[PDB]
Design a protein around this nucleic acid. Structure first.
Ligand SMILES: NC[C@H]1O[C@H](O[C@H]2[C@H](O)[C@@H](O[C@H]3O[C@H](CO)[C@@H](O)[C@H](N)[C@H]3O)[C@H](N)C[C@@H]2N)[C@H](O)[C@@H](O)[C@@H]1O
Ligand SMILES: NC[C@H]1O[C@H](O[C@H]2[C@H](O)[C@@H](O[C@H]3O[C@H](CO)[C@@H](O)[C@H](N)[C@H]3O)[C@H](N)C[C@@H]2N)[C@H](O)[C@@H](O)[C@@H]1O
Lengths: 275, 275
DNA sequence: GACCCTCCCCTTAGGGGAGGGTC
DNA sequence: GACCCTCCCCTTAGGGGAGGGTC
């Protein structure tokens, strides 16, 4: 015998007016009475029960046209719909959960770049392993290597990590080169950062890693004059301190920013392993 | 010296054409060259680097106008933005994680209702505790009690669980009543299903629970003729098997469906505790 | 005054599709 | 032929606000 205006319901049910009006329009929840002249909406007390579900499902995030299907459902049938919701949640849980490790690790790798002891000078250091995806570089050089050169590797990684490599890598044979002009990349690769499977990897992609070990490194900010010089510096450090190299030179390039409105700049790192 | 059409980039970067066009419109990522007559878009190989971030941030779910702010940021500053993302993730993780327990528990309570040994007959059984929110019922009766009668309790629960009670409860003193006409509810309550804090609960709300114990129950599907009868049945079962009651009668009403296009139906349960 | 009505413009990140024109 | 262009209509769950009228 008590009837509620939209305002009354709104306050009562902690749902907004514009919201009830909306739910009225999509015929998910309609007033018991619409005065035909004033088009005012009036609601019975016994209606409010229909909101409990709506409100819940909303909180869960069920889309509206979907609630409508849910309303009809009988107790046993609704139960199942819930466990559907349960499974859908576990997914998001996984998906984020994964992302959390990913980002913490992206961050961990960004740290070293800012904590690098000095630029332009060579030093040795003890390195954790880095897993990576590589492919034969088909006669590519520092000179003519392209971004596009990476696109297949980059599919795989994205399909795997979801989270595109900040980084670009290539390797080549440690030699007394005298010229950029003399150098060819053996493979080019990009680091993976998930231990998530890589479905349907084709066999022209080797999964391998930059082994744990001790490394003569040198790292600077790119510019053409320095590239070759710093390589030189490296070779020298080896030959002088008289060491035995046991890998290629690994070279990794990392943007310092992605502003398309500032001049491009990149951090380069050449490392190599020793006995 | 190699330039890419939108199609070329799209395939290269595994981003859609309509997507690059869009990113062009919002000046997040613009081609290096737009032919002035054909309005064809052309891109440099050295541009594709700007997509790695975009693509990542997208995967993380960063909104676009926000990526723009991120692009300018310097390595140290970007690092922080990430940990912002890290914290924002942990929230969702919590939020869902909570929901998962909630739903598993909503489900657990829905089960018993469908696994209830028989309807209309009384039996005793051993009950887990049920926490709940209640309030003095201010002389309310089975006769005149309303949905609205619950609205404050229901705020609290929603503010706490997010997930509106499927259920509605009231209690009253076990007596040889002869009439619905004789009955008053002592409190009316609604079960909580989170152990999450209930911020700024006002003191006219008692947090308490339906204690763990042994209970004479009876549960049926509502209709006016049966209500009082089944109560009667209950009283009788006690008096005959000669038992001592140690609580009020708890009464709980639960919709069987929320279809607003079928006749309303409800499951009632009256239980009481014994020594 | 305080509610309530309808109606209209607004948001995100594009996809689908038309009706051209181009490489 | 296969690319690419612009332009337009579409989606979700409403909120904000106008310009009335009503309880
Ligand atoms: N590793 C080659 C890389 O190409 C791009 O850019 C990096 C290159 O190394 C530079 O290219 C060359 O610059 C000069 C003339 O081109 C040469 O003297 C020099 N030896 C080369 O390094 C480029 N311009 C900037 C940045 N350093 C990408 O970031 C990455 O796809 C890829 O890994
Ligand atoms: N507990 C009272 C409850 O009111 C509503 O509905 C339930 C009531 O119990 C019924 O009300 C009464 O129906 C008859 C005439 O009104 C009476 O003879 C009977 N004794 C009463 O129970 C109602 N119509 C259906 C459903 N059972 C709500 O679900 C809930 O807010 C609240 O808990």
């Amino acid at each position: 015998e008590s009837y509620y205006s939209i305002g009354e319901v709104s306050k009562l049910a902690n749902v907004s007016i514009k919201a009830l009006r909306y739910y009225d329009k999509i015929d998910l929840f309609k007033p018991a009475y619409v005065d035909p002249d004033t088009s005012y909406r009036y609601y019975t007390d016994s209606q409010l029960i229909h909101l409990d579900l709506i409100k819940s499902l909303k909180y869960i995030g069920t889309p509206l046209e979907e609630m409508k299907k849910a309303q009809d459902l009988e107790m046993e049938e609704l139960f199942a719909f819930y466990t559907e919701q349960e499974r859908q949640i576990r997914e998001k849980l996984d998906f984020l959960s994964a992302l959390e490790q990913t980002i913490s690790l992206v961050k961990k790798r960004m740290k070293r770049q800012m904590e690098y002891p000095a630029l332009g000078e060579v030093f040795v250091l003890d390195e954790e392993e880095i897993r990576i995806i590589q492919t034969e570089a088909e006669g590519l050089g520092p000179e003519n290597v392209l971004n596009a050169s990476y696109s297949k590797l980059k599919k795989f990684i994205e399909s795997a990590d979801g989270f595109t490599n900040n980084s670009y890598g290539a390797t080549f044979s440690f030699q007394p080169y005298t010229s950029i002009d003399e150098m060819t990349y053996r493979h080019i690769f990009t680091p993976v950062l998930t231990n998530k499977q890589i479905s349907s990897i084709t066999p022209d992609m080797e999964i391998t890693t930059i082994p744990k070990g001790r490394y003569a490194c040198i790292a600077y900010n790119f510019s053409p004059e320095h590239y070759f010089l710093n390589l030189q510096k490296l070779i020298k450090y080896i030959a002088d301190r008289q060491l035995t190299v046991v890998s290629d030179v690994y070279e990794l390039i990392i943007p310092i920013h992605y502003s398309p409105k500032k001049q491009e700049e990149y951090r380069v790192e050449m490392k190599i392993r020793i006995l």
